[PDB]
Amino acid sequence: AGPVTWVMMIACVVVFIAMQILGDQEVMLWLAWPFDPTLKFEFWRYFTHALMHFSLMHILFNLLWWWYLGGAVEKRLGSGKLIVITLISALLSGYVQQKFSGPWFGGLSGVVYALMGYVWLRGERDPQSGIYLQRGLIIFALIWIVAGWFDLANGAHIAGLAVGLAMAFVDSLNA
Numbered sequence: 001a002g003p004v005t006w007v008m009m010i011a012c013v014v015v016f017i018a019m020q021i022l023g024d025q026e027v028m029l030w031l032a033w034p035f036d037p038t039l040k041f042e043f044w045r046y047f048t049h050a051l052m053h054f055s056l057m058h059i060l061f062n063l064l065w066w067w068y069l070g071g072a073v074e075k076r077l078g079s080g081k082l083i084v085i086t087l088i089s090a091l092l093s094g095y096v097q098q099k100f101s102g103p104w105f106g107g108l109s110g111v112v113y114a115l116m117g118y119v120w121l122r123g124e125r126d127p128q129s130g131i132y133l134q135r136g137l138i139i140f141a142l143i144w145i146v147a148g149w150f151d152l153a154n155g156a157h158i159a160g161l162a163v164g165l166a167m168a169f170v171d172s173l174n175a
């Protein structure tokens with residue numbers, strides 16, 4: 001797995017540990033989306049919310065998905081491609097989550113939705129390239145989506161998905 005796939009995974013584990021130790025609240029105090037005018041200009045906060053996870057279950061699956069999809073995109077398409085997908089989806093989903101439900105949140109699932117969308121759409125319009133989303137894995141990706149949609153936020157997730165579909169569109173549009 002590439003340097004980008006790895007660094008993100010390691011950081012999510014590190015933050016998660018910092019969260020078990022000092023408690024979630026303390027960590028969010030520093031990494032969460034600005035929750036006061038006084039934090040307005042602390043720029044890392046527009047991205048660092050994707051690094052926090054609140055349950056073993058979430059970071060486990062988010063990282064599995066990230067490891068499979070992110071790794072595939074970085075290897076066949078390059079680190080740069082994964083960095084842009086992650087940056088834009090993290091900002092957009094973070095923004096939509098923030099707008100309808102407040103600054104207290106976290107998770108890499110917004111970015112993960114960008115990846116599922118991207119891998120699947122490129123692999124359907126530009127078969128040729130090695131990046132497609134396995135038939136069986138489309139089924140388990142759906143189950144995962146379902147788990148999330150029926151709370152077993154959805155807006156933040158569609159925004160993440162929208163960034164991925166948009167980018168696969170643009171790409172499978174070059175040639």
Ligand SMILES: CCCCCCCCCO[C@@H]1O[C@H](CO)[C@@H](O)[C@H](O)[C@H]1O
Pocket residue numbers: 043044047048050051086087090111
């Ligand atoms: C979707 C994943 C997003 C991850 C984004 C991580 C960005 C971390 C930016 O931190 C910066 O690191 C510098 C290193 O020296 C500090 O000096 C500076 O104060 C701090 O702002």
